[model samples]
Target chain A: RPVLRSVNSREPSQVIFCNRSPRVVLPVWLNFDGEPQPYPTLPPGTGRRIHSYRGHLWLFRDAGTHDGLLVNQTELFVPSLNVDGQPIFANITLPVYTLKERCLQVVRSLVKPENYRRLDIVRSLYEDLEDHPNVQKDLERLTQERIA
Target chain B: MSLKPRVVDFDETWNKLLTTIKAVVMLEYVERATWNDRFSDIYALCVAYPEPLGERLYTETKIFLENHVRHLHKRVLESEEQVLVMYHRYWEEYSKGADYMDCLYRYLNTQFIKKNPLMEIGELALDMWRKLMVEPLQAIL
Candidate 1:
């Protein structure tokens, strides 16, 4: 279990992530330092405010099934909106994508020389996880239900 | 009671306003010309024939701006810098022209035009350019 605080003892900033996806409940996972902290299941058209140390915020969304994970990262920025005398918040519009497309998009960004071999290993695992009959059946069923 | 109301020719006033707008669009110095006379003409026409003249001005301005922006899109395809410079220049020209038009029809804008669900003269002018030029041009650039 990941503790939801700065590992470096820096001041934590309050950030808001608004799930603006038209449909589909989003499960948000925040990886603080290598430890993962789970937040509440983010319902559609809602926002959640979280306080975390200054660093890369790793965002993960499970596609339809808990097995399918879409991972991405972003540096924290000052939120543009703050409710009447509340902490500033950012609006994140989460668009759902196909499992392969989402996985490719996440993997494509990790293209450094050090991560090149890691990419292959992760991609292999992604394929293996995706190739499982149950996962494949769930992916197709979920994709159709959520996408269209 | 014999009141022979002054008859204003809709086409004639529209042509004059269109010509003035063209001059502004071409970046010709309109200050050199007597803009007050043109503004008075529009004001008079809009007052006398609000139905035909005001609607004609709106439609003609939309068409003129669309053409001008399309032409600008062609001229600024070289680079981002060129596109931005052209965009700025277009806005400057558009603002000047729209200000003149707004001043010309200030009475109509407040009393009649604003009452209707239409954007004000200056904003409409800029909106036309933004829709026809920046949105499409910026996407390609």
Candidate 2:
């Protein structure tokens, strides 16, 4: 998966965050003053508007872990990106995925063949990037930390 | 051949139009006046003497707005707050009045003003006021 896209706006402006991922829902966590604030769940193909300032950090993660979907996350840094006070366009996509052990039981019990095919199409896009060092570092930065 | 199309007396028609314009400007904040009567006066003028009166109405309204701004400018000469308040009031009335005037002369607005480089009524009123009054007083407030 590609790294999270950064967006910035001037003077505590309205930032529209769009979830462009194909399947899984994402929960946006607002990291303000280095403190994480929990936000509501964001479904796929949807958008939400948030008020943000310069240099604020935003984190996105898979909406739930109960489904045995990979625990994927991404972080975006916002700073010095204001362009003439235009509205911020933040498009959120899935972070890298690593299958959990319970994934087989979960998939056998609930996942449909078409949904598995959909997940394969999404996952195939980033397969090559998995071994790249920067991607690895970003994955660690995304998944390893305990963001509150 | 057509009995000369009932030649309009320009001065008489213009004076009556001016009187109606004044009434349009001076009506109480919530007061209503006869827009149709004034509109018919111009409509008849345009119908009878479209060339000269159309030109005259355009020029005369320009001068009327300038004179109105000049009068308000004088009123505000002594007090800044009064001038600002007067500016607000003038714009309120002028915008409404100009819209009404535009509706009254919609035919000319579309046919005459639009074809020519003439500013439409509302815009011309505001532009003239800015030039005649607001620009000069910009430094103080």
Candidate 3:
């Protein structure tokens, strides 16, 4: 068999989308023509190859529970491509953002003043963000907001 | 994600596909695994990204055959005194090659090609032999 090695060796890049949460399954959603299309859902601690490109928008939500998971305040992410355009082998994580309704219930009762148990729950609720480059600072700020 | 598997380069893939077609025509041993790769590769080219190259690939492959048949005619022409002798010898294996090509490109043959005004692999091969190579009389007194 003849082998071909020239004038035919270019390929698209791949990105890694990970569900860092220990308890929540993540749903992979893509923005297609202003509609969110769902692909296979990601189980906890699993990572999937994202067949995405530059300026491609993606959304993530807690599977089954439907809680919004975001790295920033917004729920949308536009994936980036490197300047050179080689496969951008990068990982995007789904960070923990405990639903406000759930947090509101806990923060309105004696659960808030006792503080010890609530702080412990806050620690676990934020487990998925452990990979955040500034997670320590973030967890501190979020916890202080709840106490105040 | 595109409905079709993303194909980055058209000419590059066609070059690779072109090489495999030659191997099939040359009566060379083709690994079984490679056949499926080529089979899918053919599908990929037809429904290729951003634009469909089904028509384009059909033209290239039909011509893929033109050049090869021309090469065979060149070989047969070398036997000046016994032109008929080399002609049949080449024709015998070439007939088999045509059938092999028919089976190898079966996807393109029955799928996209059947619907359009296009020639199938075996159909195209025989026509090229007569058109490009010229019809040699079956028997000479």
Candidate 4:
């Protein structure tokens, strides 16, 4: 599940790339052991057992993106948002292809009825994508291949 | 703003593009699994895009991904505006003075690839800004 406890756990102090702008990095700790630690697990358990360290935190980095771009107006690539296209990646082991599918299904099952309004549309999109063999195979493959 | 739908409120637009992002993500998984390497093509794709089309593709792709993918869907739904705001905020803050690309680069170099890796070149421009908070580059405006 890779549940995070603190910023340090995500990215340790030694690994942080303080230089980035568009993407914020936070310390993340991957709880591979899945041991239930208290909220204030204290220093010992604080971001403990955490593998990746950067001491930086950001929404994007949390989603496996390590960095982001800062586009400019004057530069040829300005107004271009692909600034961090090549450099954003995390070392976390993603779910295996099949597991990822099961995870997604679980995610679907947990949705509230009220959420259905938004989710139904999302399902329709999935169905449409399923029609394409390449897309379907790709999605299934990722779920099975993920490390988790 | 009008009563009708516009890009700003067009969340449904993502529905159509979700599969593409999944494919991209799956493709990434394949390369990483096969190569047994991190921050190579998978990481590179996250950091630097070759051109304009790539950028728009991911932006729109991610948008659609956020709308449809189950796990991603749950996260974004909890905070409907999170992804959109994230995209907006990244650009907004980057324009203040720093280079967004630097942030991306630094992250790859320092965080993912852990310095210059042999698999592929990484862009660390964004990470530079994160730590240095360098004055806005003139070109940004």
DockQ for all models, in order? Answer: 0.01, 0.00, 0.00, 0.02
Sorted by TM-score (best first), the order is 3, 2, 1, 4
Instruction: Please give the CA lDDT of all the candidate structures.
Output: 0.54, 0.58, 0.61, 0.30
On the 0 to 100 scale, the lDDT of residue A103 in model 3 is 59
Where in model 3 is the C-alpha error above 4 Å? A1-148, B1-5, B132-141
Q: What DockQ would you assign to candidate 3?
A: 0.00
| TM-score for all models, in order of appearance | 0.40, 0.42, 0.44, 0.17
Scoring only chain A, what TM-score does candidate 4 earn? 0.20
* Residues A1-148 of candidate 2: C-alpha lDDT, one tens digit per residue: 2233323334575577777775454543434323445577777778877777765656554555322121223355353345787767776765544563234434534654445544432232223223222323543476445353
Looking at chain B only, the TM-scores across the models are 0.72, 0.76, 0.83, 0.20
Candidate 1: tens digits of C-alpha lDDT, residues A40-116: 66666677767654553434344343333332222223323335646654444444556865665455445544445
- All candidates: interface RMSD: 38.5, 36.7, 22.1, 12.0
Q: Write the per-residue lDDT of candidate 3 for residues B3-91, one digit (tens) a residue.
A: 34455567877887777788877777778788777777777766565666777888898888888888887787676787767777778
The ten-residue window of minimal lDDT in model 4 chain B covers B116-125
Model 2 lDDT per residue over B1-141, tens place: 131324567778778778777766654432245555566666556545434367778888889988887776666555765766766776677667877666766755754564466877767777877775556567666
Interface RMSD of 3: 22.1
Q: True contacts preserved, each candidate?
A: 0.00, 0.00, 0.00, 0.00
Best-fitting candidate, scored by TM-score: 3
What digit string (tens of lDDT, one per residue) describes model 4 on residues B62-137? 3432333333323333555575464344435433322322232242333333322221111222333233222223
- Candidate 1, residues B1-141, lDDT tens digits: the string is 111113568777778777777776665766645577676666555545224356666677667777877776666655666766776776676677777666656755764474475777667777876765657666876
- The most accurate candidate by lDDT is 3
Q: How accurate is candidate 4 locally (lDDT)?
A: 0.30
lDDT (Cα, tens digit) per residue for candidate 3, span A18-121: 66655354544334333345577777767776666565655566555455566333445555655574544333345544485455433433333334433533
Query: Which residue ranges in model 4 land beyond 4 Å of their true spot?
Result: A1-13, A19-24, A31-123, A126-148, B1-141
